[PDB]
Amino acid sequence: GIIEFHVIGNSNRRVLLWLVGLQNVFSHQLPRMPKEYIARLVFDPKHKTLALIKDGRVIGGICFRMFPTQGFTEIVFCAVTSNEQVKGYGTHLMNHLKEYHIKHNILYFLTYADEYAIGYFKKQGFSKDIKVPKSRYLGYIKDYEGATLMECELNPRIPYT
Amino acid sequence: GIIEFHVIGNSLTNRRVLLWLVGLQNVFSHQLPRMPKEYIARLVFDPKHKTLALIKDGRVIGGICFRMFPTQGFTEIVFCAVTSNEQVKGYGTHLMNHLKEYHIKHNILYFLTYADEYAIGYFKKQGFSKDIKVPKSRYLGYIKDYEGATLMECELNPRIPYT
Amino acid sequence: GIIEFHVIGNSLNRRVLLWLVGLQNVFSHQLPRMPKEYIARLVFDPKHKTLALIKDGRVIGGICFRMFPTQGFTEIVFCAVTSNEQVKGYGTHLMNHLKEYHIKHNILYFLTYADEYAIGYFKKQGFSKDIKVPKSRYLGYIKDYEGATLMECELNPRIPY
Amino acid sequence: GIIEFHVIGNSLNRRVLLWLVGLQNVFSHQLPRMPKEYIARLVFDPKHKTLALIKDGRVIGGICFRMFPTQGFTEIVFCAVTSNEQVKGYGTHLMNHLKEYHIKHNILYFLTYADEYAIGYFKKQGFSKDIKVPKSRYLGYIKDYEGATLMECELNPRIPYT
Amino acid sequence: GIIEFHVIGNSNRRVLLWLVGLQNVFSHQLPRMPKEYIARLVFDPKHKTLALIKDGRVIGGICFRMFPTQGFTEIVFCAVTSNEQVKGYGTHLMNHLKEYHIKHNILYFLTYADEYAIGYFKKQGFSKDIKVPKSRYLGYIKDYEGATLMECELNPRIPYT
Amino acid sequence: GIIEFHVIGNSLANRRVLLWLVGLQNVFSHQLPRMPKEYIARLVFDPKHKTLALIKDGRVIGGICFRMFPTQGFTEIVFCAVTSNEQVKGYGTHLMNHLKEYHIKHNILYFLTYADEYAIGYFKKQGFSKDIKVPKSRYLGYIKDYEGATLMECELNPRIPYT
Amino acid sequence: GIIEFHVIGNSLANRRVLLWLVGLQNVFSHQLPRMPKEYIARLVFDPKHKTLALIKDGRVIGGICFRMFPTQGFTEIVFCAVTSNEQVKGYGTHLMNHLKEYHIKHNILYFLTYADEYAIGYFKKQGFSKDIKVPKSRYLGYIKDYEGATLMECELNPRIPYT
Amino acid sequence: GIIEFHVIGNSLNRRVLLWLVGLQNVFSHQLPRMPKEYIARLVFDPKHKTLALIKDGRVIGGICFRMFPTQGFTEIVFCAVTSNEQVKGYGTHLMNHLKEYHIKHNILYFLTYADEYAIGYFKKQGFSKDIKVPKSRYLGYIKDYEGATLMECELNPRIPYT
Numbered sequence A, E: 001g002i003i004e005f006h007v008i009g010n011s012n013r014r015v016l017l018w019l020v021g022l023q024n025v026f027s028h029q030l031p032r033m034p035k036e037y038i039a040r041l042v043f044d045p046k047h048k049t050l051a052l053i054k055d056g057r058v059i060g061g062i063c064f065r066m067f068p069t070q071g072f073t074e075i076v077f078c079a080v081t082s083n084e085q086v087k088g089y090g091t092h093l094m095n096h097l098k099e100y101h102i103k104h105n106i107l108y109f110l111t112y113a114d115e116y117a118i119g120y121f122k123k124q125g126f127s128k129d130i131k132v133p134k135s136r137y138l139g140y141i142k143d144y145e146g147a148t149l150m151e152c153e154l155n156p157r158i159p160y161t
Numbered sequence B: 001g002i003i004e005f006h007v008i009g010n011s012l013t014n015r016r017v018l019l020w021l022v023g024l025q026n027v028f029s030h031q032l033p034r035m036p037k038e039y040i041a042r043l044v045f046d047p048k049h050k051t052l053a054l055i056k057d058g059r060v061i062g063g064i065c066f067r068m069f070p071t072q073g074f075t076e077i078v079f080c081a082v083t084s085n086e087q088v089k090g091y092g093t094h095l096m097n098h099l100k101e102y103h104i105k106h107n108i109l110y111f112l113t114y115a116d117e118y119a120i121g122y123f124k125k126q127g128f129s130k131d132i133k134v135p136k137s138r139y140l141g142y143i144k145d146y147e148g149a150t151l152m153e154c155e156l157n158p159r160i161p162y163t
Numbered sequence C: 001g002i003i004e005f006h007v008i009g010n011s012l013n014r015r016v017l018l019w020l021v022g023l024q025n026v027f028s029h030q031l032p033r034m035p036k037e038y039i040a041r042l043v044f045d046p047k048h049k050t051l052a053l054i055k056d057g058r059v060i061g062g063i064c065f066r067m068f069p070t071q072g073f074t075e076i077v078f079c080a081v082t083s084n085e086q087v088k089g090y091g092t093h094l095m096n097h098l099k100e101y102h103i104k105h106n107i108l109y110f111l112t113y114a115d116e117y118a119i120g121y122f123k124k125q126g127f128s129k130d131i132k133v134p135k136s137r138y139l140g141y142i143k144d145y146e147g148a149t150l151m152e153c154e155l156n157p158r159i160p161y
Numbered sequence D, H: 001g002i003i004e005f006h007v008i009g010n011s012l013n014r015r016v017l018l019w020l021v022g023l024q025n026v027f028s029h030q031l032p033r034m035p036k037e038y039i040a041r042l043v044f045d046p047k048h049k050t051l052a053l054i055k056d057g058r059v060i061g062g063i064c065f066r067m068f069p070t071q072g073f074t075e076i077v078f079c080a081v082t083s084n085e086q087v088k089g090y091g092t093h094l095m096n097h098l099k100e101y102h103i104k105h106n107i108l109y110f111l112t113y114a115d116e117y118a119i120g121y122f123k124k125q126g127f128s129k130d131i132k133v134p135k136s137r138y139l140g141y142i143k144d145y146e147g148a149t150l151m152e153c154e155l156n157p158r159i160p161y162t
Numbered sequence F, G: 001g002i003i004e005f006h007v008i009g010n011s012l013a014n015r016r017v018l019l020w021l022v023g024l025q026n027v028f029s030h031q032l033p034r035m036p037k038e039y040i041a042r043l044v045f046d047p048k049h050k051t052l053a054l055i056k057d058g059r060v061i062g063g064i065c066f067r068m069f070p071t072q073g074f075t076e077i078v079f080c081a082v083t084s085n086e087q088v089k090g091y092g093t094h095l096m097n098h099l100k101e102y103h104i105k106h107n108i109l110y111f112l113t114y115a116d117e118y119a120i121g122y123f124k125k126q127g128f129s130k131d132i133k134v135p136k137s138r139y140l141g142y143i144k145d146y147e148g149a150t151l152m153e154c155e156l157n158p159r160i161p162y163t
């Protein structure tokens, strides 16, 4: 149906049910993390979420945490619901997220990828060469140990969307 | 007895809480004799200081005074004590665990603190470590420094329940 | 006509408004390979300021910059003097005002990237390739460009009056 | 006669206003190479406060400072004692008061610059050329007087200074 | 490419950037017009502008000024950006402007056209025979020595879009 | 059988008037079928158009939708219709008269209308004329132009009672 | 008797003004007895119409009803009358002289009127002309063109003391 | 000395009032065969504006005008500068300022009835006898003094006059 992207968060029913929608999709695709954890982070004020909507219904999104005081943006949760993967949705999601960030003058993503995920983060432009001083992000980015930290650098000249 | 925990603090915007804070200043000062009593009470009743209080039968029997630095990304452990006839019962670790839970819920996962010789052992068993991942450039001037004490650090795991 | 220097920006005034569009035009005209949209987005960003050089109510040049007190330097984003008034010292006065403005604001370091068409002008303004600012302090704060040369300028602090 | 301290500033009283002028006077006289008006814009800046030393009604000394609590330190801007009150301990009591004041606001580091003529006083007040504080924490905030040693003082909140 | 139309003006950031986008497209497509004149009118509040928005960015517009008291509108600027011309965009912009002017009780367009623009206005149902009296438009619309005054009369009983 | 006149219009209205406006838009739309019913609708509910409604047993049977241009010194006649089973009874004249008297009481003295081939003798019999004394500069681009229709004019005497 | 001039009308009255207006409604209709009293009354009390009243000994003895059309730059003389026991004494010429002075001070420099056969003499003596300098497009429709009545104009000079 | 321009008038502030009276003097004195009553009644009329030329406090000239925004033009009513400051560009700088003022208020036509001594000046200011504004549009809104020359000036809104 109509496909739409909304950057939504907690500061309205339509947004609220979308946020439960997202928390359902993040808990279900990322089972290794307590659903109570995903709920707090999704419904936190400082966290925003880019929501992919197919016909009223959440099917995917990205939860992030902008650190404009730090120069970068932390990518917290990335899921696309199982009957919607591998149709290039995750890419469209990352690009809207990229476009959103260049419009807000922020040019580095930082995220902790799991072994299963790294291939998709490559294909979005993320590298293992972390050019940000560890002193800049340690303690702000939620430091999963074992998970693999990656960087992305945006070019505010390219239209990502 | 009945046991309750409570994050309390001197608000600039109540009386149970007041007498509760007084009781903590009395515990901290008497269990921490080389801390001047006036210095403790200044910190406790300071607004940007919170204080997890441990209450047994309405009576303060311990607690941790801490100062959050969310902009910096870590919490300063300021005081903690358990009153003398309630130590070695596990109350000290229950305070720490609860303190750890509150701090996941507030998206902070780093504890800094200075320890004398006599407290260093306790903090290791709360899973602090001498190795400090946090940049000096981030905590210096915000945490009450202590020349002559160890700087300990603790890293919390948001995927874990502590209480 | 009489020359005026003003440090302006979007405040988050009709005369300042049309001046910011004037700057957006001489910036986007003299830096022709840069997206008009991008220059406009930055000129009108509230956290960027622009030293405008005014001659007869009309914009003839200026320097778009972005200060980083928390980091001790200022990023210089755009510098252009309009064509019919270049090589008249106008560029130098703009740079010299900027230096005066920053000494008074206790920032004594400029960081800029210089393409080959512009690097000489910056050398002649007291810039060097010798970046004394720790890389620790500027990554993720200055728009890292590849293929361009990062230049530094260190100001000399002055006791006013 | 009566000696008396007050932390004065220009916010948004005739007594306080003339007190400030006296402070600009004493500062500008004891710092003769400082432009008088640069001293003026500072004393009367809202973000600057001054610890005034009044003696029998009259400004004889002071320490002008700017607090940077979001950065954990205070910048010491001007110290001075009028010349016929120097070498009496007035300078030290002015400092010790400024310390006691800052313990109470949980700022525990002083930064300042020291020319030839006053570094010895600052060392007697416990300032060191070792700067514990991150250069990343003050480089864009404090006025640099290049040619004058930057010095730091770290405060112990557990001790009385008054 | 999601195209979309909007009648906007100066009384919101994206609207501001949208007008800058418009002032740009106008200057570049109408070079003999001073850039500052174009901006002075676009950001004048009695002047509205029908922005054509391809995939988020301005790629065309008509700056017009409505004169209800006088019973007509002034067509002030017309442009479609260079890469998007001869696709129909110019005619679609006129038709939307015509519908807006039906639903607003205004059924007369006046414009001055130089020789290169006369072809386009004839195609949009403009004519050189001006039935509005000089008494009604003169000194209200900005006249142009040597440009043809072109007139258009709309049918409120027609759908134009 | 009780017949009333009311000058109504869309105030920028209660249900009786709203329903009347609709009934007027219904009637105008049927007795004028070459007029887009969406155009009739948009005009009748315009806040600067008024309508002299002929009502019988609470029911709209006819009206004259007009547009007063007091700055220009005349009124435009927009729509004129009596329902079909009430025509040729003299309703359309009483409507014109009530409208004529309405306007001299409002110090407007000129009517302008466009009349197709099939409406011209109606207006002739209500005092309208093809000879326009109003200057083209006064009305052009203020009245809705209908190319191929005859512009008609009417001059009202304020020393006359019309009703 | 003490004579007075007062520009009055029905605003949006004062019981001394309101009785003056009927005093005028009387004098106008009685001196112009072939115009319906109703038409005179409606106008005198129309609020876009003012009246310059001539008050002798408190009673009304004449006046000039007028209508200022500033947007068009002219005023219309609509009624002029002096009580019968007070004609041929200079009253109609003072009333006009005041009307003139008043309009200079309001930056209006043209008077128009449609004079009947019996008025024309008076208007000429007040410097009125049949030669109309104001284009037809400015007054037509705004002032009523009675068949058989003579448009006459008066052009005022602001550098002249009229009163 | 210091020279400033000020569009002033009576709003229906004493330094303004004394400034208007200064204008009514200067006008009345440069235009002696015009009744001073009439000059004054205009200058202080509220539908009238006056662009004042202040040199060292003192009003040395100005232009009294009347904007007819509904009719699309502005009447020039009085132009004078003091007898001992003419022929220095003052009256031309005054009109240039009046031109810019009217561009921003989108009124791009001036009309004036000139006496024979004025005509040269308005022509240097770019006035001409070829009136594009239809009679219907200005007639009666401006008094047509017999013997006076109706002149017109069209302003170009893309040119910078000041």
Ligand SMILES: CC(C)(COP(=O)(O)OP(=O)(O)OC[C@H]1O[C@@H](n2cnc3c(N)ncnc32)[C@H](O)[C@@H]1OP(=O)(O)O)[C@@H](O)C(=O)NCCC(=O)NCCSC(=O)CCCC(=O)O
Pocket: A029, A030, A075, A076, A077, A078, A079, A080, A081, A084, A085, A086, A087, A088, A089, A090, A091, A092, A111, A112, A113, A114, A116, A117, A118, A119, A120, A121, A123, A144, A147
């Ligand atoms: C990976 C996504 C989010 C993307 O879904 P998508 O729409 O299918 O992506 P697409 O545009 O259609 O395809 C893009 C392209 O990415 C490549 N790719 C390589 N590895 C993978 C992979 N594991 N999954 C999905 N795609 C992957 C595929 O080949 C795709 O096609 P392509 O090769 O480009 O032609 C989705 O498949 C999903 O929800 N997976 C399960 C959740 C997950 O594992 N998320 C990653 C971790 S989230 C985070 O920020 C960290 C949490 C903490 C931690 O991990 O430690």
Ligand SMILES: CC(C)(COP(=O)(O)OP(=O)(O)OC[C@H]1O[C@@H](n2cnc3c(N)ncnc32)[C@H](O)[C@@H]1OP(=O)(O)O)[C@@H](O)C(=O)NCCC(=O)NCCSC(=O)CCCC(=O)O
Pocket: B031, B032, B077, B078, B079, B080, B081, B082, B083, B086, B087, B088, B089, B090, B091, B092, B093, B094, B113, B114, B115, B116, B118, B119, B120, B121, B122, B125, B146, B149
């Ligand atoms: C440390 C506490 C508060 C803990 O009391 P508790 O309820 O009895 O603890 P528990 O859970 O029952 O047992 C914990 C376990 O920790 C072990 N342990 C090893 N070393 C120590 C040690 N030094 N102190 C307390 N326990 C210690 C004990 O064997 C306990 O049993 P376990 O090993 O688990 O079988 C208590 O002993 C006390 O009141 N101590 C004196 C107050 C004190 O020194 N607190 C820490 C310093 S305050 C601060 O934040 C630092 C200020 C800056 C500076 O000091 O320089």
Ligand SMILES: CC(C)(COP(=O)(O)OP(=O)(O)OC[C@H]1O[C@@H](n2cnc3c(N)ncnc32)[C@H](O)[C@@H]1OP(=O)(O)O)[C@@H](O)C(=O)NCCC(=O)NCCSC(=O)CCCC(=O)O
Pocket: C030, C031, C076, C077, C078, C079, C080, C081, C082, C085, C086, C087, C088, C089, C090, C091, C092, C093, C112, C113, C114, C115, C117, C118, C119, C120, C121, C122, C124, C145, C148
């Ligand atoms: C470069 C400026 C802004 C300076 O204009 P100006 O008024 O002529 O300066 P001036 O005081 O009269 O001349 C002083 C001196 O500058 C020297 N110079 C050396 N190289 C150049 C050069 N490439 N362009 C202009 N001047 C240059 C001239 O020889 C002059 O020599 P002199 O000292 O008089 O003997 C102007 O020419 C201009 O707008 N040029 C075209 C646009 C441009 O390339 N601007 C500089 C790039 S913007 C930038 O690098 C900021 C960051 C951009 C990014 O991040 O990518």
Ligand SMILES: CC(C)(COP(=O)(O)OP(=O)(O)OC[C@H]1O[C@@H](n2cnc3c(N)ncnc32)[C@H](O)[C@@H]1OP(=O)(O)O)[C@@H](O)C(=O)NCCC(=O)NCCSC(=O)CCCC(=O)O
Pocket: D030, D031, D076, D077, D078, D079, D080, D081, D082, D085, D086, D087, D088, D089, D090, D091, D092, D093, D113, D114, D115, D117, D118, D119, D120, D121, D124, D145, D148
């Ligand atoms: C330095 C002060 C302010 C101190 O006043 P005081 O009453 O004499 O202090 P005290 O407690 O009685 O004496 C304590 C001790 O200070 C020692 N000392 C060593 N060197 C100096 C020195 N250069 N000046 C003053 N005292 C100095 C004296 O020997 C005393 O020693 P002691 O206590 O007996 O062991 C005074 O001498 C004075 O007013 N001097 C003139 C102004 C001045 O030098 N101010 C400090 C310059 S920094 C400033 O405020 C400007 C900004 C920085 C910049 O310009 O870059």
Ligand SMILES: CC(C)(COP(=O)(O)OP(=O)(O)OC[C@H]1O[C@@H](n2cnc3c(N)ncnc32)[C@H](O)[C@@H]1OP(=O)(O)O)[C@@H](O)C(=O)NCCC(=O)NCCSC(=O)CCCC(=O)O
Pocket: E029, E030, E075, E076, E077, E078, E079, E080, E081, E084, E085, E086, E087, E088, E089, E090, E091, E092, E111, E112, E113, E114, E116, E117, E118, E119, E120, E123, E144, E147
């Ligand atoms: C005129 C427009 C805006 C329209 O372009 P467009 O998107 O290509 O329109 P289209 O529907 O795709 O094609 C329309 C059709 O109109 C015909 N035509 C005749 N002359 C022209 C012409 N000069 N340019 C474009 N088309 C023109 C062409 O045959 C076009 O294709 P078609 O007939 O459908 O096969 C465009 O060409 C353009 O951007 N031109 C540059 C600026 C400009 O020419 N503006 C018009 C005058 S600005 C004004 O309103 C008055 C300012 C005062 C003054 O000039 O003095």
Ligand SMILES: CC(C)(COP(=O)(O)OP(=O)(O)OC[C@H]1O[C@@H](n2cnc3c(N)ncnc32)[C@H](O)[C@@H]1OP(=O)(O)O)[C@@H](O)C(=O)NCCC(=O)NCCSC(=O)CCCC(=O)O
Pocket: F031, F032, F077, F078, F079, F080, F081, F082, F083, F086, F087, F088, F089, F090, F091, F092, F093, F094, F113, F114, F115, F116, F118, F119, F120, F121, F122, F123, F125, F146, F149
């Ligand atoms: C014309 C009216 C509205 C009036 O009808 P009514 O109630 O019967 O009036 P009445 O007092 O009994 O007068 C009947 C009298 O009018 C005469 N007559 C001469 N020509 C016509 C004519 N063309 N149509 C209707 N009647 C006409 C008849 O011979 C009758 O003779 P009579 O006066 O009784 O001796 C009615 O017949 C009707 O419903 N007509 C259908 C709609 C219509 O044509 N309305 C007039 C035009 S709408 C407009 O305002 C113009 C919009 C723009 C445009 O037209 O382009």
Ligand SMILES: CC(C)(COP(=O)(O)OP(=O)(O)OC[C@H]1O[C@@H](n2cnc3c(N)ncnc32)[C@H](O)[C@@H]1OP(=O)(O)O)[C@@H](O)C(=O)NCCC(=O)NCCSC(=O)CCCC(=O)O
Pocket: G031, G032, G078, G079, G080, G081, G082, G083, G086, G087, G088, G089, G090, G091, G092, G093, G094, G114, G115, G116, G118, G119, G120, G121, G122, G123, G125, G146, G149
């Ligand atoms: C006209 C007036 C108002 C003037 O009477 P007044 O107070 O005596 O004025 P005055 O200063 O003493 O006379 C100055 C001079 O006016 C001359 N005059 C020349 N023709 C006439 C004339 N036809 N009627 C009255 N006076 C006339 C008299 O001869 C006087 O002496 P003069 O000949 O100059 O040596 C008076 O006669 C009167 O009230 N008459 C009855 C009403 C009347 O006819 N008023 C004239 C206005 S007509 C009107 O308002 C409706 C026309 C609108 C329309 O329906 O189209």
Ligand SMILES: CC(C)(COP(=O)(O)OP(=O)(O)OC[C@H]1O[C@@H](n2cnc3c(N)ncnc32)[C@H](O)[C@@H]1OP(=O)(O)O)[C@@H](O)C(=O)NCCC(=O)NCCSC(=O)CCCC(=O)O
Pocket: H030, H031, H077, H078, H079, H080, H081, H082, H085, H086, H087, H088, H089, H090, H091, H092, H093, H113, H114, H115, H117, H118, H119, H120, H121, H124, H145, H148
């Ligand atoms: C005309 C002005 C106002 C001009 O002020 P200014 O500073 O002297 O003029 P400027 O800037 O130096 O420009 C001088 C230049 O204008 C040329 N010019 C040609 N004819 C004349 C002329 N008749 N008067 C003044 N200048 C005249 C002179 O050759 C000068 O040559 P230039 O252009 O400098 O090379 C001045 O001379 C003056 O105050 N004159 C006395 C009052 C006067 O005549 N005012 C203008 C009449 S406006 C009016 O109300 C007339 C009656 C209108 C009505 O019927 O309501």
